[PDB]
């Protein structure tokens, strides 16, 4: 999760093209569709009973934009991820009790959403730079469990 200079640059160029509302809603909705147990953490957001309900849940979509904004804060502070995500780690561990494996699953869905939107621009090299970023964010988010 240490990035080459070329990888730091690839990360920024693509991020400047990200619509955080559209891609954030899509990433969180795909997490709840593909890995349904993650719906447990969001039952207070209303109907999640079916994939169609998840995809139309306004609160899931709005929350996804907040999550991707937060990933963006990591992506822009790559040398202090632990610091950037300290308070969120405590929230996710101490108050929400989300198992940290789920952070890896959300990173996997986010990489798939980036690939969907960037197509051929999301090259194997660009992907590998994002894999280091998402892994870094998950690790940092898991820290106050470690």
């Amino acid at each position: 999760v240490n990035l080459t200079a070329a990888e730091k640059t690839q990360v920024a160029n693509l991020w400047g093209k990200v619509n955080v509302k559209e891609l954030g809603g899509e990433a969180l909705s795909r997490l709840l569709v593909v890995y349904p147990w993650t719906r447990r953490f969001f039952e207070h957001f209303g109907d999640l009973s079916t994939a169609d309900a998840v995809l139309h849940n306004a609160k899931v979509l709005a929350h996804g934009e907040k999550v991707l904004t937060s990933f963006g804060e990591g992506l822009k502070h790559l040398d202090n991820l632990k610091g950037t995500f300290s308070d969120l780690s405590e929230l996710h561990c101490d108050k929400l009790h989300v198992d940290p494996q789920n952070f890896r699953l959300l990173g996997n869905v986010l990489v798939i959403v980036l690939a969907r939107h960037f197509g051929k621009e999301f090259t194997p090299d660009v992907q590998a730079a994002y894999e280091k970023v998402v892994a870094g964010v998950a690790n940092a988010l898991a820290h106050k469990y470690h």
């Binding site: 795909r30 569709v33 798939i112 969907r116 939107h117 197509g119 590998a128």
Partner: protein
């Protein structure tokens, strides 16, 4: 995978991959090797650089096995028996690595057929690749 709805979705998606299977699976292997370098240690005998004939040949074979699986969703243990022996007994592939290759296959498909890659298609293909991976690791006994 198992459910009737998932089977329909996987056969649809794989029909649209069609003759791109070998290229998309070679691309997914490259994505795996680039993003998850621990996986390269299973292929010291290959040139793993971009454009590798060995990676393209192997992608064709892996894609053929995926195409066979899509045609045998009710009898994957039998259809994939020899490959389960190879991966679990001979090669001793770590189960984590199947997740990595599956993820890179999803990335590859999402990149190349984005309109086709809906959340429902992603969930069904994920379940298919998990079922194939489970069969390939079944001999972990």
């Amino acid at each position: 995978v198992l459910s009737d709805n998932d089977k329909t979705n996987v056969k649809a998606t794989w029909s649209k991959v069609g003759d791109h299977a070998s290229d998309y699976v070679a691309e997914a292997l490259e994505r795996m090797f680039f993003s998850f370098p621990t996986t390269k240690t299973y292929f010291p005998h290959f040139d793993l650089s971009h454009g590798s004939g060995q990676v393209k040949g192997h992608g064709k074979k892996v894609g053929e096995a995926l195409t066979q699986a899509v045609g045998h969703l009710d009898d994957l243990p039998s259809a994939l028996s020899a490959l389960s022996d190879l991966h679990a007994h001979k090669l001793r592939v770590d189960p984590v690595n199947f997740k990595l290759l599956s993820h890179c296959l999803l990335v590859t498909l999402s990149s190349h057929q984005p309109t086709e890659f809906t959340p429902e298609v992603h969930a069904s293909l994920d379940k298919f690749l998990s079922n194939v991976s489970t069969v390939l690791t079944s001999k972990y006994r």
